[PDB]
């Protein structure tokens, strides 16, 4: 019927004593664990409340308890009796609040009804996430944490120390549907991707056996399936996976819990699972009180007599004995009794603080408590209570009953693990994990990684991504990005860590590569040959020799000029040196050839001859200002980009053109060999060699310009000019000595 024991201030109680689904009446099959167990706990807490002298000395709390039959329709009809007394229209019971709850559907409906009439409601067990939406239930503060706190818990068991980052499984209804909706919002917001995310909806359907296959198909990035599914469906999935004989790490939810019956005959399939309980401490004072109850003593509860006729399979009025009593051998405590006493005390403490403030200096209630401020009672004292859970003498930091800003209890779960087969706690999610990692027995005897794409090394760092699945592309030029390569300084270039682009100074120089030594020997041989001639002969010929000697000296400088490192001005100056040296050598022959065909002072002719060489120098100087005396680097498709002076110097060939005309003009005077003195008096043997040397020098130059390596083409051409210069004098001075 109803428990309506009188008191100064009366509390409300809705417990699923009878069970829904019995048939036409639907209000049969009285439930013990969810029911009398919880019901007597609320009665037990009230007995302790009035016994205690510090909560409410002059206020003895009354009780108004009504059945819910585990059905919302019957709960709403019953719950009207709480409203009926208040808002005057015997039942003279000023119901301060109700401690109803249990099944979320039942608690949601009474939350809608009691919100309208401004009565605070505390649900001892309703882990639904919908009830935390205060825009619809603003008079509903509960002691148990919601289920979206499990989503925020499992999504942190996967991120402890480089843990798994994949896969998800759901279930239909509201538990699986709403919880997974929170799991995804906790995985996306903290960098976790998901694999196949099916939803096993009905009890026994072909989807479940296909669900394992659909999860087994996604093999590489799914070895941790995040179950968020109910107990009956969990059995169906595990048995389905048992038949296929697969292996996973079932990161489960409260639905799986710590029940051994979930995995029966399939323990090795689920070995290594991770599940979360609700982390409730059994009240030991109530355990003695509940076991001390007697059918002939319990008169306050009308259901106890019928309860005594149900749990013993006897008729109190099979015939059971008189000395039968509840004992720890028969049945144990309900896993949520702590949350019931923490809900009765959540009002007595709230009512005590309200009584002290609004009616001070009075042991009993004052006239202001004849009308109870529903809004003030909820969001001033009830929503701000901070006492410690009674009858739990451990008195740890977790033993508080602080209500959240949304009227939720403090989230506290127990991470479990099935190791061979029994459940043993290996963690505690209060606000951050405290997992005993060493004690965890994993599925495959080692910690799974469950990462889709392996991280890419400093080499092969380029990635084509979903987010957790990239492609390790073999291409650090600027640490351009994890996902791109424009290939300025790529892996196919001599780059460096995060820095190396084509800017690298890969200039190529010879620096005495063992080939330039020959030009020095050739220059030395010519100087020795020139010194012997000077000594053996020490006029027009003397002046010509001096001009020829200057050309020989210029050739040596050119060999050394090319040997020097590239410079914007040094390289350009050395380029003009080659033209001046060639003109000087050619000019002396022209001057010598012009003096022979003279049948007009010698000094004036010598000055005129110098004027012929000065014109090329003036043109050479003018040509230098044409490029601004700059140098151009030499990049290419390959590495080792060179940094030298100007390349493709067509003006250098233009300078040779003036020498070629002078050389061609010298051949005009070279045709007078039959008209010139032979073997004496300025013999033409040297002139013939000079003409041949010019052709050889011209041929050598085109060959070097034809190639692109430029190893020793410039040095080789200079050696020919240096060798040719000594050859003209050597051929003429063959008879002397």
Ligand X SMILES: N[C@](CC1c2ccccc2Oc2ccccc21)(C(=O)O)[C@H]1C[C@@H]1C(=O)O
Pick out the residues of the known binding site: 38, 104, 125-127, 175, 254, 336
- Among the listed ranges 71-79, 168-176, 361-369, 535-543, the one in contact with ligand X (CB under 6 A) is 168-176
What's the chain's Rg over C-alpha atoms? Answer: 52
Among 14, 18, 27, 34, binds ligand X (CB under 6 A): 34
Q: Between residues 174 and 710, which has the closer beta carbon with respect to ligand X?
A: 174
Distance from C-alpha of 268 to C-alpha of 270, rounded to nearest angstrom: 6
Checking 595-599 for CB contacts under 8 A at 24+ apart, the result is 595/540, 595/544, 596/669, 596/672, 596/676, 596/682, 597/669, 597/672
β-strands 642-643, 95-98 pairing = unpaired
**Contact between 31 and ligand X per CB under 6 A:** no
Give phi and psi for 181, each to the nearest 5: -55, -35
Q: Which residues contact 499 (CB under 8 A, 6 or more apart)?
A: 478, 489
Q: Between 258 and 595, whose beta carbon lies closer to ligand X? A: 258
Residue closer to a copy of itself (CB basis): 306 or 649: 649
Q: Are 142 and 172 in contact (CB under 8 A)?
A: no
Pairwise CA distance, residues 109 & 96, whole Å:
19
Confirm or reject binding of residue 665 to a copy of itself (CB under 8 A).
Answer: yes
Q: Give me the DSSP letters along 62-110.
A: EEEEEE-TT-HHHHHHHHHHHHHHSS-------EEEE---SSHHHHHHH
Nearer CB in complex with ligand X: 106/572: 106
Q: Which of 457, 454, 461 is nearest to 477 (CA)?
A: 461
Q: How many CB atoms lie within 10 A of CB 464?
A: 12
- Assess contact for 122 and 401: CB atoms under 8 A: no
- State the residue for tokens 């020098």: 697
User: What span, in angstroms and rounded, lies between the C-alpha atoms of 615 and 451?
Assistant: 79
| Contact call for residue 175 and ligand X (CB under 6 A) | yes
654 belongs to the binding site for a copy of itself (CB under 8 A)? yes
| Closest CB to ligand X among residues 19, 543 | 19
Structure tokens at 404: 């959240």
Q: Which two tokens stand for residue 605?
A: 């002719």
CB 45 within 8 A of CB 345: yes
Give yes or no for residue 24 binding a copy of itself (CB under 8 A): no
Selected from 125, 262, 576, 595, the binder of ligand X by CB under 6 A is 125
- Partner from ligand X, a copy of itself, none contacting 76, C-beta within 5 to 8 A by type: a copy of itself
With CB cut-offs between 5 and 8 Å by kind, which of ligand X, a copy of itself, none does residue 482 bind? none
Question: Which two three-digit tokens encode residue 202?
Answer: 């009905």
Minimal distance, residue 176 CB to a copy of itself, in Å: 20
* Among the residue ranges 172-180, 236-244, 290-298, 684-692, the one whose residues contact ligand X (CB under 6 A): 172-180
Q: Which stretch binds a copy of itself (CB under 8 A): 184-192, 244-252, 415-423, 649-657?
A: 649-657
Q: How far is the CB of 445 from ligand X (least distance, A)?
A: 30
The entry of ligand X, a copy of itself, none that residue 48 binds, CB within 5 to 8 Å by partner kind: none
Rounded least distance, CB 665 to a copy of itself, Å: 7
Residue 532 beta carbon to a copy of itself: minimum distance, rounded to whole angstroms? 36
From candidates 601, 650, 707, 708, binder to a copy of itself by CB under 8 A = 650
- Residue 388 Cβ, how far from ligand X at the closest point, in Å? 24
SS3 annotation, 591-624: HHHHHHCCCCCHHHHHHHHHHHHHHHHHHHHHHH
Task: Kindly give the pairing relationship between strand 414-415 and strand 276-277.
Answer: antiparallel
Please report whether residue 104 would count as binding ligand X according to CB under 6 A.
yes
Using CB under 8 A, count the residues that bind a copy of itself: 20
Q: How far is the CB of 173 from ligand X (least distance, A)?
A: 6
* Minimum separation from the CB atom of position 101 to ligand X (A): 7
* Cα angle value 291/296/301 (rounded, 5°): 75
The set of residues, in sequence order, having a beta carbon less than 8 Å from that of 293 and lying 6+ positions away, is 40, 304, 325, 326
Burial of 521 (C-beta count, 10 Å sphere; 0-12/13-18/19+): exposed
Burial string for 602-616 (b: 16+ CB within 10 Å, else e) reads eeebbeebeebbeeb
Q: Which of a copy of itself, ligand X, none sits in contact with 352, Cβ below 5 to 8 A by type?
A: none
The yes or no reply on residue 127 touching ligand X (CB under 6 A) is yes
Quote the tokens at residue 59: 């206020």
Query: Least distance in Å: CB of 3 to a copy of itself?
Result: 19
Based on the shown chain and the rule CB under 8 A, indicate whether residue 575 belongs to the binding site for a copy of itself: no
Annotated binding site for L-glutamate: 38, 104, 125-127, 175, 254, 336
Dist. CA 251–CA 274, nearest whole Å: 4
Distance of closest approach, residue 706 Cβ to a copy of itself, in angstroms: 13
**Minimal distance, residue 605 CB to a copy of itself, in Å:** 15
Number of residues that bind ligand X (CB under 6 A): 16
| Residue 351 near residue 96, CB atoms below 8 Å | yes
- Closer residue to ligand X, CB minimum distance, 127 or 168: 127
Among 464, 661, 695, 703, the residue binding a copy of itself under the rule CB under 8 A is 661
Q: Which of 77, 232, 332, 373 binds a copy of itself (CB under 8 A)?
A: 77
- The footprint of a copy of itself on residues 90-149 (CB under 8 A) is 109, 112-113, 115-117, 136
419: CB partners within 8 A, 6+ apart: 271, 272, 440, 441
Options 235, 336, 412, 575; binder of ligand X; rule CB under 6 A? 336
Q: How far is the CB of 395 from a copy of itself (least distance, A)?
A: 42
Q: Does 619 bind a copy of itself (CB under 8 A)?
A: no
87 vs 538, beta carbon nearer a copy of itself = 87
Task: Name the helix (H) or strand (E) containing 557.
Answer: helix 540-563
87 binds a copy of itself (CB under 8 A): yes
Residues found near ligand X in the complex (CB under 6 A): 34, 102-104, 125-128, 173-175, 230-231, 254-255, 336
Binding region for a copy of itself (CB under 8 A): 76-77, 80, 83, 87, 109, 112-113, 115-117, 136, 650, 654, 657, 660-661, 664-665, 668
């Amino acid at each position: 019927r109803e428990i309506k024991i009188e008191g100064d201030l009366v509390l409300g109680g809705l417990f699923p004593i009878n069970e829904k689904g019995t048939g036409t009446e639907e209000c049969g099959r009285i439930n013990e664990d969810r029911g009398i167990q919880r019901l007597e706990a609320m009665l037990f807490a009230i007995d302790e409340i009035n016994k205690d002298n510090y909560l409410l000395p002059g206020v003895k709390l009354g009780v108004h308890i009504l059945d819910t039959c585990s059905r919302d329709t019957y709960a709403l009809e019953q719950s009207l009796e709480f409203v009926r007394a208040s808002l005057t229209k015997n039942i003279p019971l000023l119901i301060a609040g109700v401690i109803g709850g249990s099944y979320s559907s039942v608690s949601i409906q009474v939350a809608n009804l009691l919100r309208l009439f401004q009565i605070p409601q505390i649900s001892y067990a309703s882990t639904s996430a919908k009830l935390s939406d205060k825009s619809r239930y603003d008079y509903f503060a509960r002691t148990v944490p919601p289920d979206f706190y499990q989503a925020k818990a499992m999504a942190e068991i996967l991120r402890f120390f480089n843990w798994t980052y994949v896969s998800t499984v759901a279930s239909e209804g509201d538990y699986g549907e709403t919880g997974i909706e929170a799991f995804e919002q906790e995985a996306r917001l903290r960098n976790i991707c998901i694999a196949t995310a099916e939803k096993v909806g009905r009890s026994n359907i072909r989807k479940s056996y296909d669900s394992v296959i659909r999860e087994l198909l996604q093999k590489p990035n799914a070895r941790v399936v995040v179950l968020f599914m109910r107990s009956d469906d969990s059995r169906e999935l595990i048995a389905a996976a048992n038949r296929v004989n697969a292996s996973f790490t079932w990161v489960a939810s409260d639905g799986w819990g710590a029940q051994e019956s979930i995995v029966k005959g399939s323990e090795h399939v689920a070995y290594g699972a991770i599940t979360l309980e609700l982390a409730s401490h059994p009240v030991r004072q109530f355990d003695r009180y509940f076991q001390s109850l007697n059918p002939y003593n319990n008169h306050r509860n009308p259901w106890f007599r019928d309860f005594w006729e149900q749990k013993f399979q006897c008729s109190l009025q099979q015939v059971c004995d008189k000395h039968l009593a509840i004992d720890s051998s028969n049945y144990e405590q309900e896993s949520k009794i702590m949350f019931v006493v923490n809900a009765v005390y959540a009002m007595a403490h709230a009512l005590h603080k309200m009584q002290r403030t609004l009616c001070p200096n009075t042991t009993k209630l004052c006239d202001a408590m004849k009308i109870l401020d529903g809004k003030k009672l909820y969001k001033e004292y009830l929503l701000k209570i901070n006492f410690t859970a009674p009858f739990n003498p451990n008195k740890g930091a977790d033993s508080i009953v602080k209500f959240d800003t949304f009227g939720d209890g403090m989230g506290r779960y127990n991470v479990f693990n099935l190791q061979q087969y029994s459940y043993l706690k290996v963690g505690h999610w209060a606000e951050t994990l405290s997992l005993d990692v060493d004690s965890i027995h994993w599925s495959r005897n080692s910690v799974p990684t469950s990462q889709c794409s392996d991280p890419c090394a400093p080499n092969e760092m380029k990635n084509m991504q979903d987010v957790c699945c990239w492609i390790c592309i073999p291409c650090y030029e600027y640490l351009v990005d994890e996902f791109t390569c424009m290939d300025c300084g790529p892996g196919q270039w001599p780059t460096a860590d995060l820095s190396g682009c084509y800017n690298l100074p890969e200039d190529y120089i010879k620096w005495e590569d063992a080939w330039a030594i020959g030009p020095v020997t050739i220059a030395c041989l010519g100087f020795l040959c020139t010194c012997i001639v000077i000594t053996v002969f020490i006029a027009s010929g003397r002046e010509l020799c001096y001009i020829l000697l200057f050309g020989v000296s210029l050739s040596y400088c050119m060999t050394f000029f090319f040997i020097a490192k590239p410079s914007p001005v040094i390289c350009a100056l050395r380029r003009l040196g080659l033209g001046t040296s060639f003109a000087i050598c050619y000019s002396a022959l022209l001057t010598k050839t012009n003096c022979i065909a003279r049948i007009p002072s010698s000094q004036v002719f010598i000055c005129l001859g110098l004027i012929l060489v000065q014109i090329v120098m003036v043109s050479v100087w003018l040509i230098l200002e044409t490029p601004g005396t700059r140098r151009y680097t030499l990049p290419e498709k390959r590495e080792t980009v060179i940094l030298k002076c100007n390349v493709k110097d067509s003006s250098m060939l233009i300078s040779l053109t003036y020498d070629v005309v002078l050389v061609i003009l010298c051949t005009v005077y070279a045709f007078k060999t039959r008209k010139c003195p032979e073997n004496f008096n300025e013999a033409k043997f040297i002139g013939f060699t000079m003409y041949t040397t010019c052709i050889i020098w011209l041929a050598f130059l085109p060959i070097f310009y034809v190639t692109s390596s430029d190893y020793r083409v410039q040095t080789t051409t200079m050696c020919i000019s240096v060798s040719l210069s000594g050859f003209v004098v050597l051929g003429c001075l063959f008879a002397p000595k």
